[PDB]
Design a protein around this motif. Structure first.
Motif, PDB file in Angstrom:
ATOM      1  N   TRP B  68      72.918 116.109  37.079  1.00  0.00           N
ATOM      2  CA  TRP B  68      72.367 117.450  37.247  1.00  0.00           C
ATOM      3  C   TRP B  68      72.780 118.303  36.063  1.00  0.00           C
ATOM      4  O   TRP B  68      72.003 119.121  35.568  1.00  0.00           O
ATOM      5  CB  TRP B  68      72.853 118.094  38.545  1.00  0.00           C
ATOM      6  CG  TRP B  68      72.203 119.423  38.859  1.00  0.00           C
ATOM      7  CD1 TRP B  68      71.051 119.619  39.565  1.00  0.00           C
ATOM      8  CD2 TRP B  68      72.676 120.732  38.493  1.00  0.00           C
ATOM      9  NE1 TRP B  68      70.776 120.964  39.663  1.00  0.00           N
ATOM     10  CE2 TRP B  68      71.756 121.669  39.012  1.00  0.00           C
ATOM     11  CE3 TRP B  68      73.784 121.202  37.774  1.00  0.00           C
ATOM     12  CZ2 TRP B  68      71.910 123.048  38.838  1.00  0.00           C
ATOM     13  CZ3 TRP B  68      73.936 122.576  37.602  1.00  0.00           C
ATOM     14  CH2 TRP B  68      73.002 123.479  38.131  1.00  0.00           C
ATOM     15  N   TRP B  69      74.015 118.105  35.614  1.00  0.00           N
ATOM     16  CA  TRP B  69      74.547 118.861  34.492  1.00  0.00           C
ATOM     17  C   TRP B  69      73.913 118.429  33.166  1.00  0.00           C
ATOM     18  O   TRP B  69      73.861 119.208  32.213  1.00  0.00           O
ATOM     19  CB  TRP B  69      76.068 118.714  34.432  1.00  0.00           C
ATOM     20  CG  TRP B  69      76.726 119.681  33.489  1.00  0.00           C
ATOM     21  CD1 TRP B  69      76.830 121.034  33.641  1.00  0.00           C
ATOM     22  CD2 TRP B  69      77.377 119.366  32.251  1.00  0.00           C
ATOM     23  NE1 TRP B  69      77.502 121.581  32.573  1.00  0.00           N
ATOM     24  CE2 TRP B  69      77.848 120.578  31.706  1.00  0.00           C
ATOM     25  CE3 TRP B  69      77.604 118.176  31.548  1.00  0.00           C
ATOM     26  CZ2 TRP B  69      78.537 120.634  30.492  1.00  0.00           C
ATOM     27  CZ3 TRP B  69      78.287 118.234  30.341  1.00  0.00           C
ATOM     28  CH2 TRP B  69      78.742 119.455  29.826  1.00  0.00           C
ATOM     29  N   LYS B  71      70.774 117.332  33.259  1.00  0.00           N
ATOM     30  CA  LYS B  71      69.408 117.823  33.404  1.00  0.00           C
ATOM     31  C   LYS B  71      69.319 119.286  32.980  1.00  0.00           C
ATOM     32  O   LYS B  71      68.411 119.672  32.239  1.00  0.00           O
ATOM     33  CB  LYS B  71      68.905 117.669  34.842  1.00  0.00           C
ATOM     34  CG  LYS B  71      67.424 118.037  35.008  1.00  0.00           C
ATOM     35  CD  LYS B  71      66.884 117.788  36.418  1.00  0.00           C
ATOM     36  CE  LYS B  71      67.188 118.945  37.371  1.00  0.00           C
ATOM     37  NZ  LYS B  71      66.514 118.760  38.690  1.00  0.00           N
ATOM     38  N   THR B  72      70.278 120.091  33.436  1.00  0.00           N
ATOM     39  CA  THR B  72      70.227 121.536  33.215  1.00  0.00           C
ATOM     40  C   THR B  72      70.452 121.846  31.743  1.00  0.00           C
ATOM     41  O   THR B  72      69.720 122.632  31.142  1.00  0.00           O
ATOM     42  CB  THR B  72      71.265 122.294  34.075  1.00  0.00           C
ATOM     43  OG1 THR B  72      72.571 121.738  33.872  1.00  0.00           O
ATOM     44  CG2 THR B  72      70.899 122.203  35.546  1.00  0.00           C
ATOM     45  N   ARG B  73      71.496 121.240  31.185  1.00  0.00           N
ATOM     46  CA  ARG B  73      71.653 121.122  29.742  1.00  0.00           C
ATOM     47  C   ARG B  73      70.805 119.947  29.262  1.00  0.00           C
ATOM     48  O   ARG B  73      70.501 119.052  30.050  1.00  0.00           O
ATOM     49  CB  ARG B  73      73.116 120.910  29.362  1.00  0.00           C
ATOM     50  CG  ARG B  73      74.041 122.063  29.703  1.00  0.00           C
ATOM     51  CD  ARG B  73      75.477 121.746  29.303  1.00  0.00           C
ATOM     52  NE  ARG B  73      75.611 121.432  27.878  1.00  0.00           N
ATOM     53  CZ  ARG B  73      75.817 120.210  27.387  1.00  0.00           C
ATOM     54  NH1 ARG B  73      75.914 119.172  28.207  1.00  0.00           N
ATOM     55  NH2 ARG B  73      75.928 120.024  26.075  1.00  0.00           N
ATOM     56  N   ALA B  78      65.779 123.077  28.668  1.00  0.00           N
ATOM     57  CA  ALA B  78      66.927 123.402  27.826  1.00  0.00           C
ATOM     58  C   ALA B  78      66.638 123.183  26.344  1.00  0.00           C
ATOM     59  O   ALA B  78      67.079 123.961  25.494  1.00  0.00           O
ATOM     60  CB  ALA B  78      68.139 122.580  28.254  1.00  0.00           C
TER      61      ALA B  78
ATOM     62  N   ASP F   8      76.956 123.392  40.281  1.00  0.00           N
ATOM     63  CA  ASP F   8      76.084 124.514  40.611  1.00  0.00           C
ATOM     64  C   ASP F   8      76.894 125.791  40.822  1.00  0.00           C
ATOM     65  O   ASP F   8      76.482 126.864  40.378  1.00  0.00           O
ATOM     66  CB  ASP F   8      75.248 124.207  41.853  1.00  0.00           C
ATOM     67  CG  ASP F   8      75.728 122.960  42.575  1.00  0.00           C
ATOM     68  OD1 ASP F   8      76.350 122.105  41.909  1.00  0.00           O
ATOM     69  OD2 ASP F   8      75.497 122.821  43.800  1.00  0.00           O
TER      70      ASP F   8
END
Ligand SMILES: [Zn+2]
Ligand SMILES: [Zn+2]
Ligand SMILES: [Zn+2]
Lengths: 17, 91, 97, 35, 61, 107, 227, 82, 214
Positions: B68-69, B71-73, B78, F8
């Motif tokens: 997830w980290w 994906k977000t970065r 991004a 999160d």
RNA sequence: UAAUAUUUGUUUAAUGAAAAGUAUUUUAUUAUUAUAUUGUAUAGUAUUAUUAUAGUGUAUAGUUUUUUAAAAAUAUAA
RNA sequence: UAUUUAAUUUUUAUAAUUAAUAAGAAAGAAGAAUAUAAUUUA
């Protein structure tokens, strides 16, 4: 001597063992 | 391993070897956000360092948190702002 | 080729010329790392000599080669050198058409 | 069985024949007849 | 009294352990600044037996 | 489950946090003196301040009530005057800094 | 496994010899502290099937040092208990070994064995030390006086200077042996070993200290004599 | 520019005899049961040797009652309802 | 970083070079074969305090900023510490992480834009100002002609009275040409050495100098 | 039996410890705010045993004794 | 543990005239150990 006197006239690499 | 400081929660990641096993839960490192030495906690597991012969390297599989980290970065949303400059596979 | 001892025989050349057409896309300007017996260390020392190219390794004067394999120490250099020497002419030919 | 013919091995002399050369030679003979 | 004592002892060792740590990181950074200084005159690149061009390519870096 | 995966939510402690019983501020991270109760809502108590604000005794089985922003124990919130514990009086059973609350919480 | 760090410990010839331990994890731990110590201090007196392992692994470390790559730096950094010795490993070994490609570590079998068990002793070294920065003239024939002192230097080489960042670290490490709580640890160790009982360990009232101030004021004296 | 626990205690106002007592076991400071090694216990004087006591050979491991009375056991004047 | 391989030929990123990094002319026959194109492992770059301060210091002079056109704004300064567009990109990544920069699409056209976050905006103001108060002490024009300094300050505070805007777009081009003309004499050398922290991560220490050519 | 089995001390989160009813503390030790008097460290199960029982009270002191240079079969796990 | 079988007593230049269904200077690692009988190496 002349070279240190050039250095001195203007006035490390291998350590003395 | 994912690490965040107690105070600003700055997130970053590096692999932890078998030599560093005693440092896994708590780290001390320099935060870019609050500049001075801080204390980091281990939220999520990512990956091994070494792998045995005839076995996949890529399955101590890193958890959903880490993915997830990443994906977000480093993601579609991004990279899209930064692709105008670099498009990182390119210089 | 790769595992040959000592001198490089002509038969061995035939091998290389056979594998020229084995790979469809090849140009004399290709990076060094496509060569037989070019490892990491062998590529690097060629790079600091400003050599990126199969043409450029085929341009060696053989006294650059030996100090590449003796004074410096990239081993198996004459193998890759000779590998260039063979293959550079056919490549030009295939490049034209 | 401990005799000399059996125990002694020729490994050290294998440079006297080019193994890698003959394998590739019969590769050539493999593509010449088209197997 | 001993609840307060049990936390009185476990708070201040936590306090001074940081005093060990911050001075240690201070010292290690002093050390690496010494490497930064010294490796200049000796000309140590610390990047291997290869010259600057090799890493300059950055294909191998 | 162990090691709440918090990407999160940062779960950092705000320096502007004050005690929920005594209304005095919190030394941010450097001490385990404060009992922090994330509700997966931040609840910050001191250690000495975890107790009831009515009877000033311990909170039984670490479950409580809070009225007008001050924490009461359930016997004192259920309309009962029976007041005295057997075991200990003026502290609580709690585990400092979220370690008691990290067992079951938002993942 | 062809990768020049990661270890394969078997008995078949393709594999480097497994030395006896509890687990392959334990073998890895042992190997790691051996390599760390050897990089810190060029020689290791090492018994058993451990020494050839040290030889091969040291050759691997020098290979990584010659790589001089950030991936190499990082992979060596995974392997060692010391981060600092990694820096030492990439400062020293390339200049030391620039003229050699093969066999960087010398193994020498000692004619003495542990009294404890029959296992033989091997003396594992790095090769040519006249190219090294901090190990330049050192003598390993006998040990130093108290083991926190810098080791013996050959009489013809006395006046050699060493990288400052290394003797800083060495002095910081050696400075905790002059405080008296180490002396208490020393006496208490006598008590402990005597309790577990181990012969020829004197009573803690006979154990007069490793470090005194008179010995320090002569040791520092001769140390600036070497400087 | 080292740590120096005494100057670390002086900077923290920790009473430097106490700060050291944090880093040795509670057996060596406070009156509390704990594992003791009989070689530490001390020995009477032989004909060859002198006496051996745990006053000379272990000063820093002996118990301090400043700390013990101020930390563990109660003061009487706090409780006096008289 | 070599102009022939990593990029199409004839391109020169204008900025500070790295010390003893040769520019070696690559012939154009050059290509990788397709499986070698994925090799490309970049040397890590300095994302540390200095380049962050510089890219911020640029991002302050234009409150909106076009991401696509930023590189030239960067090159525009006498003060560049930066190497490639890659070096820039990374600095922007971590600057985004620290919360100093937010990326917004304005879209009317396709433009992508940088906003200095409303939260950290104080800090940046310290950073820029601090730079401005150091260099005026190290500028060689002062303590020779004070009339220069006064004629500069008075005219700027009097120009800010009507429109100070056009004066700036007129000003920065002399900055570009002064920088371009000065670059012929002296370059900024980026020097680096690797080290290992206590957690055992390889990271680089940097320092910058300026060498003269003539 | 027996040149046998056993043992075999190269890296510690045993934090804590009143219920132990044995162990030359040469003077173990207040500076007190209190008064006299008295008393503080390792032996449960034939052991320095597998390893204790329980009541405190607390969470980043790593709080620092486990040999070994092939293969069967036995014991675990993949 | 006794008998009984099976293996071994560490390169025997070599094997079988018959029974029943075979033995030349010695022990650390058989490897200088990451399968080359040295990959050039100070
Ligand atoms: Zn932080
Ligand atoms: Zn409170
Ligand atoms: Zn209540």
């Amino acid at each position: 001597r002349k070279e240190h006197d050039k250095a001195l006239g203007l006035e490390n690499r291998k350590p003395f063992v | 391993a994912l690490f965040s400081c107690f105070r600003c929660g700055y997130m970053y990641e590096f692999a932890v070897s078998n030599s560093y096993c005693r440092k896994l839960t708590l780290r001390n490192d320099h935060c870019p956000r609050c500049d001075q030495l801080t204390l980091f906690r281990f939220m999520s597991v990512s990956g091994m360092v070494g792998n045995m012969p005839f076995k996949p390297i890529g399955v101590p599989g890193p958890s959903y948190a880490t993915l997830w980290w990443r994906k977000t970065r480093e993601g579609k949303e991004a990279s899209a702002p930064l692709d105008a400059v670099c498009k990182s596979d390119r210089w | 080729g790769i595992a040959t001892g000592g001198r490089v025989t002509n038969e061995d050349r035939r091998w290389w010329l056979v594998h020229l057409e084995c790979a469809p896309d090849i140009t004399p300007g290709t990076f060094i790392a496509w060569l037989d017996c070019c490892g990491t260390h062998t590529c690097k020392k060629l790079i600091e000599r400003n050599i990126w190219t199969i043409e450029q390794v085929a341009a060696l004067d053989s006294d650059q080669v030996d100090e590449l394999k003796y004074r410096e120490g990239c081993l198996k250099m004459d193998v890759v050198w000779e590998h260039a020497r063979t293959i550079i002419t056919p490549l030009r030919q295939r490049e034209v058409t | 069985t401990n005799r000399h013919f059996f125990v002694a091995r020729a490994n050290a002399f294998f440079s006297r024949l080019p193994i890698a050369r003959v394998q590739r030679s019969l590769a050539m003979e493999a593509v010449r007849e088209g197997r | 009294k001993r609840i307060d004592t049990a936390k009185r002892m476990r708070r201040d060792r936590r306090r001074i352990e940081e005093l060990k740590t911050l001075e240690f990181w201070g010292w290690y950074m002093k050390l690496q600044r010494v490497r930064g200084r010294w490796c200049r005159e000796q000309g140590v690149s610390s990047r291997g037996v290869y010259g600057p061009a090799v890493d300059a390519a950055e294909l191998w870096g | 489950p162990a090691y709440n995966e918090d990407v999160d939510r940062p779960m950092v402690v705000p320096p502007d946090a004050i005690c929920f019983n005594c209304d005095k501020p919190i030394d941010a991270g450097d001490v385990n003196s404060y009992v922090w109760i994330p509700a997966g809502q931040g609840y910050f108590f001191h250690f000495g301040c975890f107790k009831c604000n009515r009877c000033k005794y311990r909170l039984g089985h670490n479950k409580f009530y809070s009225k007008d922003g001050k924490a009461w124990c359930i016997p004192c919130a259920l309309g009962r005057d029976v007041r005295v514990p057997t075991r200990r009086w003026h502290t609580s059973y709690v585990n400092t800094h979220r370690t008691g609350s990290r067992l079951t919480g938002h993942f | 496994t062809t990768e020049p760090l990661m270890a394969d410990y078997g008995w078949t010839r393709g594999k480097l010899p497994k030395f006896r331990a509890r687990s392959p994890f334990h073998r890895q731990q042992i190997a790691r502290r051996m390599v760390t110590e050897m990089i810190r201090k060029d020689y290791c007196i090492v018994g058993g099937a451990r020494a050839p392992a040290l030889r091969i692994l040291a050759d691997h470390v020098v290979e990584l040092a010659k790589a001089g790559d950030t991936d190499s730096r990082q992979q060596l950094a995974y392997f060692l208990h010391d981060p600092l010795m990694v820096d030492k490993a990439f400062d020293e070994y390339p200049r030391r070994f620039k003229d050699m490609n093969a066999k960087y570590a010398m193994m020498t079998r000692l004619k003495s064995r542990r009294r404890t068990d029959a296992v033989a002793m091997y003396f594992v070294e790095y090769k040519n030390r006249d190219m090294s920065d901090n190990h330049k003239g050192e003598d390993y024939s006998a040990g130093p006086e108290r083991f926190f002192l810098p080791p013996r230097i050959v009489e013809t080489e006395k006046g050699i200077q060493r990288p400052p960042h290394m003797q800083m670290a060495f002095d910081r490490w050696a400075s905790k042996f002059k405080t008296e709580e180490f002396h208490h640890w020393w006496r208490l160790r006598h008590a402990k070993l005597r309790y577990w009982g181990v012969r020829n360990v004197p009573h803690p009232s006979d154990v007069d200290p490793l470090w005194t101030e008179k010995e320090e004021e002569e040791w520092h004296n001769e140390m600036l004599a070497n400087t | 520019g080292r740590f120096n626990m005494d100057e670390a205690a002086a900077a923290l106002q920790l009473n430097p005899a106490y700060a050291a007592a944090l880093y040795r076991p509670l057996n060596y400071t406070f009156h509390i049961r704990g594992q003791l090694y009989p070689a530490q216990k001390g020995r009477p004087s032989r004909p060859g040797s002198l006496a051996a006591s745990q006053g000379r050979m272990f000063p820093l491991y002996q118990r301090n009652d400043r700390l013990d009375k101020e930390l563990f056991r109660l003061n009487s004047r706090g409780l006096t309802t008289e | 970083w070599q102009s022939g391989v990593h990029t199409p030929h004839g391109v020169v990123y204008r900025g500070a070079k790295m010390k003893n990094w040769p520019e070696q002319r690559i012939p154009e026959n050059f290509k990788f074969t397709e499986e070698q194109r994925f090799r490309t492992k970049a040397i890590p770059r300095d994302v540390g305090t200095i380049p962050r301060n510089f890219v911020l210091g640029v991002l302050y002079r234009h409150q909106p900023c076009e991401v696509g056109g930023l590189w030239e704004h960067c090159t525009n300064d006498p003060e560049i510490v930066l190497d490639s567009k890659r070096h820039l990109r990374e600095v922007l990544k971590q600057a985004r992480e620290e919360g100093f920069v937010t990326f917004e699409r304005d879209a009317i056209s396709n433009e992508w834009l940088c906003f200095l976050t409303r939260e950290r905006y104080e800090e940046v103001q310290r950073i820029v100002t601090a730079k401005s108060e150091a260099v005026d002490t190290h500028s060689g024009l002062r303590g020779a002609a004070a009339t220069e300094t006064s004629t500069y300050a008075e005219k700027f505070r009097e120009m800010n009275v009507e429109a100070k805007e056009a004066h700036a777009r007129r000003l920065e081009e002399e900055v570009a040409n002064t920088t371009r003309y000065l670059r012929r004499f002296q370059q900024r050398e980026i020097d680096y050495l690797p080290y290992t922290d206590l957690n055992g991560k390889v990271n680089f220490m940097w320092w910058y100098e300026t060498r003269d050519v003539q």
